[PDB]
Amino acid sequence: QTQQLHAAMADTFLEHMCRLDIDSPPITARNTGIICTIGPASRSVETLKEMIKSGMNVARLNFSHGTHEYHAETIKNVRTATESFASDPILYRPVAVALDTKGPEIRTGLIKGSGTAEVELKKGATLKITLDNAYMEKCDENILWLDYKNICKVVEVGSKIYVDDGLISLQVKQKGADFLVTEVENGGSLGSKKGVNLPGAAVDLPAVSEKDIQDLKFGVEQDVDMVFASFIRKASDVHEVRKVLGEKGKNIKIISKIENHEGVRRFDEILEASDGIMVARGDLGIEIPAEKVFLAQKMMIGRCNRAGKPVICATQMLESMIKKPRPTRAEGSDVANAVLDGADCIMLSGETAKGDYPLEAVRMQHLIAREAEAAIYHLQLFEELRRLAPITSDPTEATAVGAVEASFKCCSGAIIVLTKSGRSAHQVARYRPRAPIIAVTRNPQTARQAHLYRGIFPVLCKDPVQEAWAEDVDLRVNFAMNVGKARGFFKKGDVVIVLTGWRPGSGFTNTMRVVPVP
Amino acid sequence: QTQQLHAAMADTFLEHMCRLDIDSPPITARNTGIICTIGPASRSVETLKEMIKSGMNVARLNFSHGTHEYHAETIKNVRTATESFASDPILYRPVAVALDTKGPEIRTGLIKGSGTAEVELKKGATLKITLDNAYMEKCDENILWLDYKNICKVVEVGSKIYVDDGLISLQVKQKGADFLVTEVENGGSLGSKKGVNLPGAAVDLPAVSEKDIQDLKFGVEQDVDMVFASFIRKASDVHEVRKVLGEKGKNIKIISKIENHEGVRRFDEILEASDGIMVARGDLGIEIPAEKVFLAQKMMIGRCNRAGKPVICATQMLESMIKKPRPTRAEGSDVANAVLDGADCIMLSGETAKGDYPLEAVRMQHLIAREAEAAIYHLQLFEELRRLAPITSDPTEATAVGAVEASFKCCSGAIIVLTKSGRSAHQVARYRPRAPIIAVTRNPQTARQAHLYRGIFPVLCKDPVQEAWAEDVDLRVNFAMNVGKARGFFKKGDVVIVLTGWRPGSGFTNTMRVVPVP
Amino acid sequence: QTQQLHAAMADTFLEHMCRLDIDSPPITARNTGIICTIGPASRSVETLKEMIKSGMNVARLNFSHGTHEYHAETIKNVRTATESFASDPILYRPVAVALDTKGPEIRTGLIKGSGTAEVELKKGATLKITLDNAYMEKCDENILWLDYKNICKVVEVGSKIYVDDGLISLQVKQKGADFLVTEVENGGSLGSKKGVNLPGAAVDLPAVSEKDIQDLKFGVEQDVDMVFASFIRKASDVHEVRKVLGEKGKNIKIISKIENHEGVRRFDEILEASDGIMVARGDLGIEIPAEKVFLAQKMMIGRCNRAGKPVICATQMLESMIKKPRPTRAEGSDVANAVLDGADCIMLSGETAKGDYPLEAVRMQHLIAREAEAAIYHLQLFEELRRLAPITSDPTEATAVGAVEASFKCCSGAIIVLTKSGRSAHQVARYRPRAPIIAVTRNPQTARQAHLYRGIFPVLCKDPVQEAWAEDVDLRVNFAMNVGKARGFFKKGDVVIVLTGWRPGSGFTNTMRVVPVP
Numbered sequence A, B, C: 001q002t003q004q005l006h007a008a009m010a011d012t013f014l015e016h017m018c019r020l021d022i023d024s025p026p027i028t029a030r031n032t033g034i035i036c037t038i039g040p041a042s043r044s045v046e047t048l049k050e051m052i053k054s055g056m057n058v059a060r061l062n063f064s065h066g067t068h069e070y071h072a073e074t075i076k077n078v079r080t081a082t083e084s085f086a087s088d089p090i091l092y093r094p095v096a097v098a099l100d101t102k103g104p105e106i107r108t109g110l111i112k113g114s115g116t117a118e119v120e121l122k123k124g125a126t127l128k129i130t131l132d133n134a135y136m137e138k139c140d141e142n143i144l145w146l147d148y149k150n151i152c153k154v155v156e157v158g159s160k161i162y163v164d165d166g167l168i169s170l171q172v173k174q175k176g177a178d179f180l181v182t183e184v185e186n187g188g189s190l191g192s193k194k195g196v197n198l199p200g201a202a203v204d205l206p207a208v209s210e211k212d213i214q215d216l217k218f219g220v221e222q223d224v225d226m227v228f229a230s231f232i233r234k235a236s237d238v239h240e241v242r243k244v245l246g247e248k249g250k251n252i253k254i255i256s257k258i259e260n261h262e263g264v265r266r267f268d269e270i271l272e273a274s275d276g277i278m279v280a281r282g283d284l285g286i287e288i289p290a291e292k293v294f295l296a297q298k299m300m301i302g303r304c305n306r307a308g309k310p311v312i313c314a315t316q317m318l319e320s321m322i323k324k325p326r327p328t329r330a331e332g333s334d335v336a337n338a339v340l341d342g343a344d345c346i347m348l349s350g351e352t353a354k355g356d357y358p359l360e361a362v363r364m365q366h367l368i369a370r371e372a373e374a375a376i377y378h379l380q381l382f383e384e385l386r387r388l389a390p391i392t393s394d395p396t397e398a399t400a401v402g403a404v405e406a407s408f409k410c411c412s413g414a415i416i417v418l419t420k421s422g423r424s425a426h427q428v429a430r431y432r433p434r435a436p437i438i439a440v441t442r443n444p445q446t447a448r449q450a451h452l453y454r455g456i457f458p459v460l461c462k463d464p465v466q467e468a469w470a471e472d473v474d475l476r477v478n479f480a481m482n483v484g485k486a487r488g489f490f491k492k493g494d495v496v497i498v499l500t501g502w503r504p505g506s507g508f509t510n511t512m513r514v515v516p517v518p
């Protein structure tokens, strides 16, 4: 038995678990999108080509750092490597480009302006925090500058302050009008321009700073597929991002990063307003107790699955692979469990952006996700997503669920979906079939954006529109068959589900056919 | 609400995920046992006391290294630290001692000659490896030492051999008659006395070596509670461990460690023959592909849960805490998911044996387990264990599921069980109540062995047996009431369930009472 | 096998249906209560003896006819019959006495004058209804009188009027000041003093008339066990009845009869106010379209089951058995499907009151019920009753659900419950065990009232209270054992469940034991 099909027939979850089988090889298709952060280790054209071959689907640009021109060149190299495979349209793989905003970050200043300079803060020592720019480049063991002007307004005597991704902690003893006097609680060696978290503080920085405004405008001009908007606290923040992008960037997907308590409490209204959600475990594990992160992760992935919107699990997934060519057992486990949880995508940060094994990290993500998709208990997942999804009069929605039902019944090799905007394919993906969803499109952007949805293998038809509708459908359907056979999803004589519109220019995908592979 | 009781009421697993809430705090009780490997960083009487206070339930000793004299000292210290709390029998925590056999290991030697400490080899490099035994002192990046004779009886050319937690990958370029030259693939930092794995070979080493025989006999002499048997490949391996322990060590629990392909494949006969199971992920993730471990882990926990036998999840759960005071996010997830999987106990190795933050590690496991236990979907778990329960005429079994049902209905503070052998408490634990199980025993050994069962808080009643049954019963009940109050499990006015026998002895548990706390 | 135990292990409802086996003989015990209307055909001490032997649990007296002294005679004969078996306390079966009030009935006047003649009406013919008391004794095929003064105020042209328990249909063609001119819909002989129904008309007779009051007061003097209150339309109706019964009759159960549209629309408040419900299908089927009766039956049985309150299914169950000794197929089906619906009791009207075969009717209900009860899909029933019953701090509720859980686990012969008021036994019955519930009481009245609850076999202890509580429990327990052996419920060596309290008095059931039958 293949792809855990022995465990798939179990009537209980428990028995399904008991039947999982390390000798039951998975199918070749991998449904979960892989998002890579690009930096020094992975920004060369030649390295990017191997990232694509290994499984990268989306390139993430971290606008916390780097100049516009530095990112412009990262974008170019990505497009260059992606297009280098375009000569064969059957084998071509769209690669999305995402921009991760700085958002309302709080950063320290420079330590004695030296570079190789740190100070060892001793636990129990006092440290003054000032906001006076004359100290902007003169930080040491007694005085510390940071860039959050109104920090005194939202902090109180007894408040905690984390510095350098939570490695150092301080507790505030005194407030002056425009300074803080703190006591070191967790000692450490403090470098320069490090990140500051204020857990439980009602931080009043703008959702979109002036810099973000510029950054978003830059993204529009560079044709980015999606925006990962940092530190989203409420629905109004999303609407702000939406308004900046405006008319010109209306088709750019906005993915809200939930990285603090507020985002978690306001999660429902953020989800309603966004196109998708990133569980940003880095900051979140600082802002709320680390032992509670898994709950937030599961809750958010559950609600997105329920709502039908993509959700990305991020940060520290294969962390130890920054230095090592293999991951820990806990890391292998965390990737698989993000998939079983329901994550549409998984993400690499430092592993791809700066580490010593960017390609091995991508490869490992691809291998684990594939195993985990086979182990999904589709029988219960399908029963539940239905029960929790409303009665609609939308015909493409009815069609989509009919097709997933049909794909489980004939165990089909794929669900081929013809789509312009991608919506029809998304509506199929939300019901989580086991068969890969081959979305044939002519819109290059919809092709790139489809990577956000579990199961979608997006495919770009380069052929010009034939005037005879029936023939043009056939062209696109046959192209999907050819892609499938080439990648080994299925072979001649296999059964596939094909979804198409009935009428030329209906805007509905309301037709399903069960069809042998030619 | 509290302890995820909102998610507890959900009609589907999806909806249950959607309701998990980081602002719903866990109960104070912690059902999952914590087993700690004791070594250089944690073997002092002073550190041990803190380990007990942090939450350590079982002290593991790894017999891969160390003399009999070294280990007796550690055992001595564990007992001294444990007995340091015996003055108040209401606060005494029984601590089990476990012996982890070396088993059929294959290891390496020292370094260079000028310093037998720590060196390296480069990437893609080549490497001479020996089947002669003169070069153990001087092993560097050129010519390396193993300890396996009939190697090439079971080996091939171009075959994979791994080294040092398999962080070093090598393929044999060519062999000969019985010696090795190879080529590096995953180059890294080479150290001293590092482990070697041969994925694929049905290795001919014995299950219980001559050294194992000495260690097991030492184990009997020392009165150990349990044995972790390394590299169990089949049921006759377990029986040979049982035979070496013999009449004298017949009450010692045998826990088979499943850490290669054969053990996975023969899991059923091994489980039937064992007292419980360890999922030993360190070696398992080298012996089988890393991406497959989580499947082997969830299958084994599933089948153990179904059989009612203890299962331990082990290795690299909090690995990065060897050097850091906080875990990664993947580590947070891993611990949490082992608990949601159904694991009776989670284990720490390097994290407590040799790392810089042993106390932090134990405390992090304690916090995560508790959060995870609240997030369990008991409604479905209890339903499935009941359906997948063979119906029996066994009266003790009927009382036990009766008790668990009752404890859900009235959300009780505990299930109090009076037990001599532990069996009665084990019967309650296998139905996975949410409420902690206070197992009151006069037998010190069963009190220690009970740590293996999820949910069991064992308490050792030191008071003389009383002649009247009823009064002796009521004195042990009251002792349990006082422990629970003292540990904050419940308070005056709370409801508990109480399981007892109709007369003295084993197999007579047939009485369940719903009782207020006085 | 036996009692469809094969069918009850099925994992689906459909599979359950598939396995029902006409050759699977049921267990001797019959859980569903049987209520019989006493009349001319059945009031002799001698017929009443055979009614009991045949399975009658409740004797219902209709107070629409006959003097108080008449009913007191009938009552005395019920009591004589019941007490004839009293010499042997182990075989004695309590029998309940129920009072069914007349309520707001509408009745015609006397036909012709020549005693009680039966004028025949013809389809198409004109009939006139009048309140002119001149025709009080002078009804005929042209002009008919009835006892409802306000009929003209509450009827309209087009209204349907029904006569003789639904037999004759009339349509209002002409309303006068004093009279109605109607056209006959279907022919049929009209008797004297027949019953009238007005569907879709706001009838304004008091739900508790002055006759009702005397009758209820009489009930109290006569020490009846329960009242079946006719034509209950709303909660206040039920509260009036409770008031009339007052302090003296507080222990008397009020069962509301739902017989019209309003009763069904305001069902929820009526249930809250009542001790139980009667689905009174004779009138109900005339008051609402006949094709809707099953919807309301199944709705009310469902809701009563969910609230844990008794529900009775009544009227025309075995109708053809008034004139024949074998029922129709439709009737065999209706009794079985009422038990499958969830009804605690089934009832006989004319069958036992005025029919030529009273004893054949009682036996046929006894047989059908016992077959139907074995066809119950207990797996899903018990799962659902759990999920949907609250989490409560009430100890006796936990004990109760614990005991039903245990009784499924060990397939017990019975659940024995010691109860003073009956509540402990009621609490078990709401979870619908398969095993008969032997309720041992010393209170003759609760013994009689227990017949309202599915699965309770009441037995009345006559022994004197023993001074030592512990011994006085065992005395009653042992009595239930003896009762079970004689009744063929179980034998020596079978396992039974026993529920007792920790002290004398009501509200202290907290102890469940699983115990071998001695």
Ligand SMILES: O=C(c1ccc(NS(=O)(=O)c2cccc3cccnc23)cc1)N1CCN(c2cnccn2)CC1
Pocket (backbone or CB within 6 Å): A013, A014, A017, A305, A339, A340, A341, A342, A375, A376, A377, A378, A380, A381, A384, B013, B014, B017, B298, B340, B341, B342, B376, B377, B378, B380, B381
């Ligand atoms: O490892 C898993 C697991 C396996 C597969 C999982 N993903 S799944 O097959 O797609 C799935 C299946 C059914 C419902 C789902 C709802 C949301 C997300 N995934 C669902 C999720 C978890 N366990 C779930 C069942 N287990 C439990 C745990 N607690 C109570 C009952 N069963 C043991 C561990």
Ligand SMILES: O=C(c1ccc(NS(=O)(=O)c2cccc3cccnc23)cc1)N1CCN(c2cnccn2)CC1
Pocket (backbone or CB within 6 Å): C013, C014, C017, C339, C340, C341, C342, C375, C376, C377, C378, C380, C381, C384
């Ligand atoms: O004859 C029955 C039936 C059988 C048993 C019934 N009662 S039961 O076993 O105690 C039962 C079982 C499960 C839930 C119940 C809820 C309320 C009352 N009874 C329940 C009630 C009805 N049915 C017709 C066929 N049935 C199917 C078969 N396949 C699909 C859907 N329904 C089930 C209901």
Ligand SMILES: O=C([O-])C(=O)[O-]
Pocket (backbone or CB within 6 Å): A230, A257, A259, A279, A280, A281, A282, A283, A284, A314, A315
């Ligand atoms: O920003 C992030 O990606 C994070 O904090 O996890």
Ligand SMILES: O=C([O-])C(=O)[O-]
Pocket (backbone or CB within 6 Å): B230, B257, B259, B279, B280, B281, B282, B283, B284, B314, B315, B349
């Ligand atoms: O033996 C172990 O602990 C392992 O390999 O995981």
Ligand SMILES: O=C([O-])C(=O)[O-]
Pocket (backbone or CB within 6 Å): C230, C257, C259, C279, C280, C281, C282, C283, C284, C314, C315
């Ligand atoms: O009164 C009744 O019992 C009826 O109408 O069924």
Ligand SMILES: [Mg+2]
Pocket (backbone or CB within 6 Å): A230, A259, A280, A282, A283
């Ligand atoms: Mg962040």
Ligand SMILES: [Mg+2]
Pocket (backbone or CB within 6 Å): B230, B259, B280, B282, B283
């Ligand atoms: Mg090992």
Ligand SMILES: [Mg+2]
Pocket (backbone or CB within 6 Å): C230, C259, C280, C282, C283
């Ligand atoms: Mg009536």
